[PDB]
């Protein structure tokens, strides 16, 4: 199967430059060309540019002319994006994505990537505190959770059970909270009377600070 | 470049039913009868999934409820019937000329039932209450339609300023919405206080529902 594989989250400096990843399998890497799109909140989406592993062959927007660097090394079947100059205009999400001929153009793409955070700051790097959300004392179905709280720079992921419990799961998008930090809550409705016999645990993954943090959530015995 | 407006940029459409988005490029994408328009659709932590390439033709994989129409410089995407999975935002996109180009994007919502909330309170923990921070959250689950009001009131006194308020994304099986507000005092004053009540008004609620702890009490 076709299958883009992007480098992970990154937070670098402004006036820097970052180089991300897309590691390509399931086809011949020289005979395709690599897109890569911009996603910002309020800006849909970008195209950046495209490149040709077969050759080096580079198409740009006229907006990321000096901006945007790409290349590839086809001994790993790995395309790159380098980004210069950074400021906080460049936070956003990034794609790499195949391309492939129909008609007389190449622009219908398929297969995506999935994406790579960039994140530019020069705060630091926070890894959150996790907190319980307990099922009140005071019915057929409760609610429990677990409360993410004051992590930079985003991401957070959260599963439950190992990924055992997924229905009733709500994992709600992070604030910017006025410290500058993230914050996050993920719930799941449950029978009341499980309770006593099921065993929960949210399992929380900020991976840009490495902090996993398996919290068990037990109902306050009051 | 070839400029692509999408309208309109928010529909909402009932279950069953079809929903159809406009695409218009500023300059004409036919070439030797096919018409080099592309649509996508994308959910929120996901890329965009190729629907329809050159105008109509159907993706591999992609349900048949899907389909495309147009050519010159006006297209249309056409979803029926409209499922619940259908919920996210969709973009056209030009493959005709570099730059290639986006729509604005056009977000999808479904038109369900009227479904109250349930709601739930709850302290800040003891591990936090160890920090100097409280952090009380108040939770409406599985709601339609996405118009909710949730007030704050401590010791009875209304509360402004210090909450913030997130909202899922529709759910991809039940068209319903929930919403987290979370209330943030230090520790000195959560403990100046001792009722601590979340107020939530909604379509479905014939009036006001309130949850609420008395610190400590547990």
């Known amino acids: 199967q076709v299958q883009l594989k992007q480098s992970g989250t990154e937070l670098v400096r402004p006036g820097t430059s970052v180089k991300m990843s897309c590691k390509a399998a399931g086809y011949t890497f020289t005979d395709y060309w690599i897109g890569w799109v911009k996603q910002r909140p309020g800006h849909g989406l970008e195209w950046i540019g495209d490149?040709?592993?077969?050759?080096?062959?580079?198409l740009y927007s006229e907006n990321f002319m000096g901006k945007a660097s790409l290349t590839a090394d086809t001994s790993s079947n790995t395309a790159y994006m380098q980004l210069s100059s950074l400021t906080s205009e460049d936070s956003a999400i990034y794609y790499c994505?195949?391309?492939?001929?129909?008609?007389?153009?190449?622009?219908?793409?398929?297969?995506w990537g999935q994406g790579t955070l960039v994140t530019v700051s020069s705060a630091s790097t926070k890894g959150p505190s996790v907190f319980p959300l307990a099922p009140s004392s005071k019915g057929g179905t409760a609610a429990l959770g677990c409360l993410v709280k004051d992590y930079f720079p985003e991401p957070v992921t959260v599963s439950w059970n190992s990924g055992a419990l997924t229905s009733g799961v709500h994992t709600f998008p992070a604030v910017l909270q006025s410290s500058g930090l993230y914050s996050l809550s993920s719930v799941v409705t449950v029978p009341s009377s499980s309770l006593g016999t099921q065993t929960y645990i949210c399992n929380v993954n900020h991976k840009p600070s490495n902090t996993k943090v398996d919290k068990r959530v037990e109902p306050k015995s009051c | 470049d070839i400029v692509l407006t999408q309208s309109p940029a928010s529909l909402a459409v009932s279950l069953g039913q079809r929903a159809t988005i406009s695409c218009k490029a500023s300059?004409?994408?036919?070439?030797?009868?096919?018409?080099?328009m592309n649509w996508y659709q994308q959910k929120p932590g996901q890329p965009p999934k190729l629907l329809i390439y050159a105008a109509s033709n159907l993706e591999s994989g992609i349900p048949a409820r899907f389909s495309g129409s147009g050519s010159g410089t006006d297209f249309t995407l056409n979803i029926h019937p409209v499922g619940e999975e259908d919920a996210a935002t969709y973009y056209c996109?030009?493959?005709?000329?570099?730059?290639?180009?986006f729509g604005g994007g056009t977000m999808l919502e479904i038109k369900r039932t009227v479904a109250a909330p349930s709601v739930f309170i709850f302290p800040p923990s003891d591990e936090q209450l160890k920090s100097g921070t409280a952090s009380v959250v108040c939770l409406l689950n599985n709601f339609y339609p996405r118009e909710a009001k949730v007030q704050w009131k401590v010791d009875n006194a209304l509360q402004s300023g210090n909450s913030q308020e997130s909202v899922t994304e529709q759910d991809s099986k039940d068209s319903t919405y929930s919403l987290s507000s979370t209330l943030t005092l230090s520790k000195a004053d959560y403990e100046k206080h001792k009722v601590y009540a979340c107020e939530v008004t909604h379509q479905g609620l014939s009036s006001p529902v309130t949850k609420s702890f008395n610190r400590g009490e547990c």
């Open positions: 996109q030009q493959s005709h000329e570099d730059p290639w180009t």
């Open positions: 300059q004409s994408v036919d070439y030797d009868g096919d018409s080099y």
């Open positions: 994505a195949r391309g492939h001929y129909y008609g007389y153009s190449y622009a219908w793409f398929a297969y």
């Open positions: 490149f040709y592993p077969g050759g080096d062959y580079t």
